[PDB]
Structure 1
Amino acid sequence: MVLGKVVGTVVASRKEPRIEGLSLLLVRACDPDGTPTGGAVVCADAVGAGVGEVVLYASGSSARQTEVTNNRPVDATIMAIVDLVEMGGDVRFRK
């Protein structure tokens, strides 16, 4: 599970029906500053995340251990909306 800042949305119309209604989001890993520095990865929402929010997306075989993401084919999903990120006792990120 990696920090990430939402960047955009992906829209697919021809997809496996088990997943329809899933919200596809585009996240780039961010340094603990909110400044996105990484490659684009897609993930489904399960928390009601929007663009511009800093999130945690879990990946792989354990990205399905959440309802409306069960035996569905998904290998990356959001699971949290950060509120502050501490580093050594000095806050580096806020809402």
Structure 2
Amino acid sequence: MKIARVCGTVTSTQKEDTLTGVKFLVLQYLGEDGEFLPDYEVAADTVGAGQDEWVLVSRGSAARHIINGTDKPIDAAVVAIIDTVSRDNYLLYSKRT
């Protein structure tokens, strides 16, 4: 999985029937030391991730194993909203509780 931040949304009306009701988040990947990387992923979200929150994103067939994702033609999804990130036992990020 990869760490990213929620940076936006994608909207559509003309799409695969299987994607009705699917909320599309734009994600910006985060690199070393929280770096805002020039790289993004449109991902489905069934967790409830807010703008600017840090998330874990899974890509490939894993996306289809989110709740109700089985028949969905999606290759990226939010599977967790990050509460904490740490390196060598020291905190570098925390979420608003």
CA distance in structure 1 between the partners assigned to 2:94 and 2:38 by the alignment: 20
Superposition pairs of residues 65-84 of structure 1, within 5 angstroms: 65-84=65-84
Answer 1 or 2: which has greater helix percent.
2
Report deviation, 1:31: 2.6
Structure 2 residue 92 is matched with structure 1 residue 92: yes
**Count of aligned positions:** 95
Give 4+ residue runs of structure 1 displaced > 3 Å after superposition. 32-35
Answer 1 or 2: which has greater strand percent.
2
Report the CA distance shift for 1:32/1:53 in structure 2 as closer, same or farther (over 3 A).
farther
Amino acid at match of 1:48: G
- Other-structure match for 2:41: 41
Q: Relative to structure 2, which stretch is displaced further, 43-52 or 62-71? A: 62-71
What per-residue deviation string (whole Å, max 9, x for no partner) do you get for residues 28-53 of structure 1?
A: 11135444223121000010112111
Amino acid at match of 2:59: S
Structure 2 residue 52 is matched with structure 1 residue 52: yes
CA distance in structure 1 between the partners assigned to 2:60 and 2:47 by the alignment: 18
- Other-structure match for 2:28: 28
Percent pairwise identity: 35
Structure 2 unmatched ranges of 5 or more: none
Alignment root-mean-square deviation, CA? 1.3
TM-score by length of 2: 0.90
